[PDB]
Amino acid sequence: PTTENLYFQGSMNIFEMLRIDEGLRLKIYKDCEGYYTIGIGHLLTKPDLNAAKSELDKAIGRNCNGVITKDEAEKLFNQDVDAAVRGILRNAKLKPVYDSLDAVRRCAAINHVFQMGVTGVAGFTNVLRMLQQKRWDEAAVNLAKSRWYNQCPDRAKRVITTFRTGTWDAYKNL
């Protein structure tokens, strides 16, 4: 690794990770599952655009008519990351597994929750046991069986690789 390459891990964190997986959109769009989304992966609601816009105005605090700024995207993103972290730490099932993980895999954990929500993740009984037991190849094969990955592979693939390796390699060379 070059001097530069060794710096790359210090430039990666959960925010940068999710920013790559989710992208950044300033107008309402439908995600890969068809759900109204804005900003950096902010799911507004699970078909009526009108509902999605009302949730938007509620989330941002002004009349947005479907559009936000980059600064507003960031603030909402930071709130969503905080919610995912808090969701793990309060959960009797996820906290122990999360605690056992290294820093990089903890980012993958927070990412997984950000994308699927707490109960979805906490339902992956086998994967969670594999993670705690450091069976990284098995955890990754099992994650690759999930609907979460399979219905929308490009959003999940780097997270799965990150669970396998505990490195940031999947986020290099975009």
From Swiss-Prot:
Q: What class of enzyme is it?
A: hydrolase
In its UniProt record, which GO terms are filed under biological process?
cell wall macromolecule catabolic process; defense response to bacterium; peptidoglycan catabolic process; viral release from host cell by cytolysis
For this protein, the record's SUPFAM superfamilies field holds: Lysozyme-like
Matches recorded under InterPro entries = Endolysin_T4_type, Glyco_hydro_24, Lysozyme-like_dom_sf, Lysozyme_dom_sf, Phage_lysozyme-like, T4-type_lysozyme
- Chief localization class? host cell
An example of a GO molecular function for this protein is:
lysozyme activity
Q: Please tell me, according to the UniProt entry, what happens when changing G41A.
A: Almost complete loss of enzymatic activity
Q: Which GO cellular component terms, listed alphabetically, does the Swiss-Prot or TrEMBL entry include?
A: host cell cytoplasm
Query: Keywords, A to Z?
Result: Antimicrobial, Bacteriolytic enzyme, Cytolysis, Glycosidase, Host cell lysis by virus, Host cytoplasm, Hydrolase, Viral release from host cell
User: Active site located where?
Assistant: E22, D31
* Name of the protein this chain belongs to: Endolysin
Listed result of changing D31 to E/Q: Loss of 99% of enzymatic activity
Family recorded in the similarity comment: Belongs to the glycosyl hydrolase 24 family.
> Which reactions fall under this protein's catalytic activity?
Hydrolysis of (1->4)-beta-linkages between N-acetylmuramic acid and N-acetyl-D-glucosamine residues in a peptidoglycan and between N-acetyl-D-glucosamine residues in chitodextrins
Q: What is the effect of changing N142I?
A: 5-fold decrease in enzymatic activity
Q: Where in or outside the cell is it found?
A: Host cytoplasm
Entry superkingdom:
Viruses
Tell me which residues bind substrate.
L43, F114, V127, N142
Q: What is its EC number?
A: 3.2.1.17
| Record function comment | Endolysin with lysozyme activity that degrades host peptidoglycans and participates with the holin and spanin proteins in the sequential events which lead to the programmed host cell lysis releasing the mature viral particles. Once the holin has permeabilized the host cell membrane, the endolysin can reach the periplasm and break down the peptidoglycan layer.
Please report what switches on or represses expression of this protein: Expressed late in the viral replication.
